[PDB]
């Protein structure tokens, strides 16, 4: 058998550093037991196993303000230290339209539009055919964290390409001053 | 935006971890053995700094709180929640341009894991890269495993992941 203890200090920035919410969570074996919520100001036990702690830590005033100043000492501080390379990170998405199947001149085809590399996650990837915004059959994967600080997303368009029409995937992302687009004329 | 400092100590394996996370992304992690901060991205070290030695200080508190609770909870073992392996690619495959195979493990506990990349059956440490265990709002764990590879037509890769709570070592095949 295994046994795990896991702590978490959390800094919730609402609209920049305007409002912050520090949360000091204590978890044993997937169960959270105690927690210090900035909005509360005092240790509150979530489960009855974590009450002996909140009880004590609350008596100690030194421990209290100690955690209480963390909305500034630690939350707002670290935000401003890292805002540069994180909050202001913008990485160029790479759009690539391609048919998932080498189908006949006209048959049930899925047009994969793979948007990759971007950051932040916020983005728009619209499908169009001859000018009309094909809403009726998109099949996205959604944001997918790649682990290396860049996302990706595959927004397919289930469409039977008529031998004489073009499909366009117009992408819009915060890192770009204009949308990235890829046109795909029927093979 | 949410910045979260996560750390844990797995009692049996005496394994621990200290890390900072921003919107689901590791800012860095302290390498216990070398006492050195290991940034996710090298450019990060250039803009900020963190004192790795404090991490090892903290884990000491975790280990403690761990031994306490383990007893205070009459030695209840953690329920092994199996992982959701998924092999994908850094970007679309094209035969000339080289690509990166990504093996993502998701929703699992305890942190102990055992991933392997097998090229045509035999393991390929030739380029392997990885991350430590990352947190999730439902307090389970994520983890990535990379394998830069050159798009072929004869190689078949499988990401073989092992976990205590997992009958057989699940392999997760991939091929161009």
């Amino acid at each position: 058998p295994r046994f795990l203890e896991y702590s978490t200090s959390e800094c919730h920035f609402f609209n920049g550093t305007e409002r912050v919410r520090y949360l000091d969570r204590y978890f044993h074996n997937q169960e959270e037991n105690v927690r210090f919520d900035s909005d509360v100001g005092e240790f509150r036990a979530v489960t009855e196993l974590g009450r002996p702690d909140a009880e004590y830590w609350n008596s100690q005033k030194d421990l209290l303000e100690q955690k209480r100043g963390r909305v500034d000492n630690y939350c707002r501080h670290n935000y401003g230290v890292v805002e540069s390379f994180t909050v202001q990170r913008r990485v160029h998405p790479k759009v690539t339209v391609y048919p998932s199947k080498t189908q006949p001149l006209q048959h049930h085809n899925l047009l994969v539009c793979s948007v990759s590399g971007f950051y932040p996650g916020s983005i728009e990837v619209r499908w169009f055919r001859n000018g009309q915004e094909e809403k009726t059959g998109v099949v996205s994967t959604g944001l997918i964290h790649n682990g290396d600080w860049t996302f990706q997303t595959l927004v397919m368009l289930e469409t039977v390409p008529r031998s004489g029409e073009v499909y366009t995937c117009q992408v819009e992302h915060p890192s770009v001053t204009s949308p990235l687009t890829v046109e795909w004329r029927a093979r | 935006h949410v910045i979260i400092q996560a750390e844990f100590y797995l009692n049996p394996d005496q394994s621990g971890e200290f890390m900072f996370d921003f919107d689901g992304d590791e800012i860095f992690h302290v390498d216990m053995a070398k006492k050195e901060t290991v940034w996710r991205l090298e450019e990060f070290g250039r803009f900020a700094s963190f004192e790795a030695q404090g991490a090892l200080a903290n884990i000491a508190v975790d280990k403690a709180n761990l031994e306490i609770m383990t007893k205070r909870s009459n030695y209840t073992p953690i329920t092994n929640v199996p992982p959701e392996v998924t092999v994908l690619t850094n970007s679309p495959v094209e035969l000339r341009e080289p690509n990166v195979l990504i093996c993502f493990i998701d929703k699992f506990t305890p942190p102990v894991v055992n991933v392997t990349w097998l090229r045509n059956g035999k393991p390929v440490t030739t380029g392997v890269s990885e991350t430590v265990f990352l947190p999730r709002e439902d307090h389970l764990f994520r983890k990535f495993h990379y394998l830069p590879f050159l798009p072929s037509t004869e190689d078949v890769y499988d990401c073989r992941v092992e976990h205590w709570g997992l009958d057989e070592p699940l392999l997760k095949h991939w091929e161009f």
């Binding site: 702590s7 200090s9 000091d24 204590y26 105690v34 002996p52 702690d53 004590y56 830590w57 421990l63 955690k67 963390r70 000492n73 630690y74 501080h77 670290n78 230290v81 890292v82 | 400092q5 750390e7 200290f18 900072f20 800012i27 803009f47 900020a48 700094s49 963190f50 004192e51 404090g54 991490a55 200080a57 903290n58 508190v61 975790d62 403690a64 709180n65 306490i68 609770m69 205070r72």
Partner: peptide, 15 residues
């Protein structure tokens, strides 16, 4: 001056 990141510390539980 390279900025530094502050770490919070988990309080020790009683026994």
């Amino acid at each position: 001056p390279v900025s530094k990141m502050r770490m919070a510390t988990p309080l020790l539980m009683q026994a």
